């Protein structure tokens, strides 16, 4: 009968290293259709979104054939972050700012100390006898923006420590709101400029048919629209039953799903002594989580009318501040060995320990 | 009759791009001689000092002919800051520490993110097909001193957050006074050394007659002695009538006067692919506002006997801290395109937004 | 009679530039055997340990002959810090955490701004006509670890400023204890890795008989076991009698003893235009005081059962934070003149002034 369906379905779905995580998807419908208790939904909906935040980033580079590298360049970093955009809007509209303030932070740390620190250790052992070099000038424009990102986080934090100023809490707490809803346009203009610089000004250095190819970016985002409602709506009741803090599930365990394609798609290229691509994945994804996914959520709240600023807290800011400074001194010469990467791993386990202990409301 | 006066007056005064801002000068005498209300004096005395903080820096490089580049090098950065030295002493002696603590700060930010960030954007569009390079080694000695400047600002800030120490306010607030009056000699010795390094040790890389030439640096500082009394003595009553905060007039609008020659004398040289000079203007002026104009005002107060420390606040320090770090990563390779400059502009509009909103005593 | 003793004793003991500081040693026994008042013991026991924290680092490089550079490399930085390890355990077991929290900090500052800043000034004047260059790649691995060290100090500081969290003091003060006893294993694994990187993976770039040679590392540590009990047990009563603060004796005057061999063993090599060795002494000693002597004391307390965290305070952290950032921009090109060194000296006198004034319990 239909001959376009027999082996093409073998070409799209099953051609991946995570074949066994698939049939835990319909049970998360079936347990929710039945009513099995809420931590058992949460255990499956972080296993039902690993081969869907990977079989979407597979289906970006098989959509550069019909559209060209101009559109196909932009959809690289767009659909590799097609989980944080789903969750950090389903959580904003459900009064749970906590998760919108950690999951958009936990993808900035995981794209800087675990996507990146593993792809220097786990490549530097393979190419220890060869010599490794990368392109500096591709990864200097990214740290300019991450310091435009950080200063927008620093100033609403320090307004909260102006208790001397003869102002109450409800006077200063709407001074953190008005200047965060105004930094968000200045963050968007320094990303729409960053596309023009990359896709038009400096383009010097910086299988499956298409009628079916659009089809598995229709359905396999809709299941991510379903298995993000189940994560967000039941994260309280599945943190009591494990005695993990919600500032550990939202900042560590949940940014393993959202960077499950940016991780095994970067340890591909670390073994080939091509660190230019495992710096275009690790850094070029953290910028959009810095400067497009964050200052769209501040606008989306303010269009809806929900109190949300850029205040992440005093403890979260020091971790984001050191991660940008340690990453800059690691990359400032263009030659890599493995000890540059083991230091980035152990500086991520420090962030895990401080947020594992912190059992505090 | 006098033939030395006819066209020489055309040579000195009128030869500038700001011919129309001149006849707003005598009205600021005439309205003050009459008694027109105080915001109308303040509107003219920031227009009467744009072509006088430019027609003095014109009359420095026409005084290198008779004196040589040894004296003529030092008077470059001396008389381009011949407005901040006038105002930040007329405000210290009038109980208005606020302006002495912002105008000496607003010239450190404007010499790092608006003098400098415009002269990479507004040159990088002109020379986008050519290639731009500068000298790193001229602009590494300047960032050593700006980190000697910052640490002298960090420690008196953190003494104010030692409320645990079993000490009152009036015990700690004279511990911020004794260590700020003692950091100021250590800041002066690392600038008198910086002149010797530049004017004597490493000199490898680093029209109008003179009897009339001294004359228009006599009078055209005396009018700056007059139109600085009118700015300082009437800045309160001309901030109520506009509902701008005095931490916005003293930190943004007033550092457009004091850097009106350092700005159009740096966008001259950005178009010639000579960025070595638009880094000797942008950085070499911020060091003196860092390390000579600030630690002379701490001494001048203490000789007079007026309580003034180096405490600028918690909100002002984070802006000064990021501006030194973002400027260092912008300059660390010696090749410029325009996207290095648009990031420095938009990181100055963040400082404008946080101080436009802050309507707080 | 014994011929192995006559001139060999002249070879071991007296062959040093500090012959006159020796006979102040037995008086510190004799005054303690008599009972002369306690500041007179403290004045001698910082003079009895200058030619013993030098005549031990002499007797390391005369123990590379029989053991080879594999063992003899490790004993360089081990016995040059054979005073801080003695004092910061004799003070931990005597309830005086103050000194364990300053002396392990005052050797991180003195190995970065006074061992290092003098060996660029006091060499750069000698070789001002020659040109000075060093190896960058030897001194990039050291700043990776010092930022793994700093972040372990930043997070227990900021837990103390979470008074909003609906938690008391005794709830948060054991959250600073549990995460400091857990960062200390992650600090040790990134130093045992640093030995393997140096002593086995990248060994490309990075007189006296031995039966007597072991003998003068037996006795001349035992006197350092004696003259460290006399410093620690009598530092209170010899700070009242001078009106110096104990946060000045423990952070300045006492880190002149512990870096008395790392100082005149680095100004040896600064005059020979060999700055590769005066960066392997200044930086390679600060890493062990960062990442082995500190996270062993946190374990040693916790094995004994004594409340000690990594909290050093808010004032001490800013000095440690700027010292790592100013040192990185000084070394980022591999060419030195003297003005890079005078800036590091005067940024150490700022730390002296802030802790000379601070007369506060």
Itemize the secondary structure elements and their pairings.
The structure is a homotrimer of 361-residue chains.
Chain A: H1 8-12, H2 25-34, H3 38-44, H4 58-61, H5 69-79, H6 84-90, H7 97-113, H8 115-124, H9 141-159, H10 169-172, H11 175-178, H12 180-201, H13 210-213, H14 219-226, H15 229-232, H16 237-240, H17 246-253, H18 282-291, H19 294-304, H20 314-330, H21 339-357
Region (Cation selection) (chains A, B, C): 80-115, 258-293
Protein name (chains A, B, C): Vacuolar cation/proton exchanger 1
GO biological process, one term (chains A, B, C): response to salt stress
Please give a structural write-up.
Chain A has 361 residues and is mostly helical. Chain A has a domain at 70-82 and 98-206 and 243-357: Up-down Bundle (A middle domain of Talin 1), CATH 1.20.1420.30. Chain A is 57% helix and 0% strand. In chain A, helix 8 (115-124) packs antiparallel against helix 21 (339-357). The longest helix of chain A has 22 residues, at 180-201. Chain A is globular and about 75 Å long. Chains in contact: A-B, A-C, B-C. Chains A and C meet through helix 20 and helix 21 of A and helix 9 and helix 12 of C.
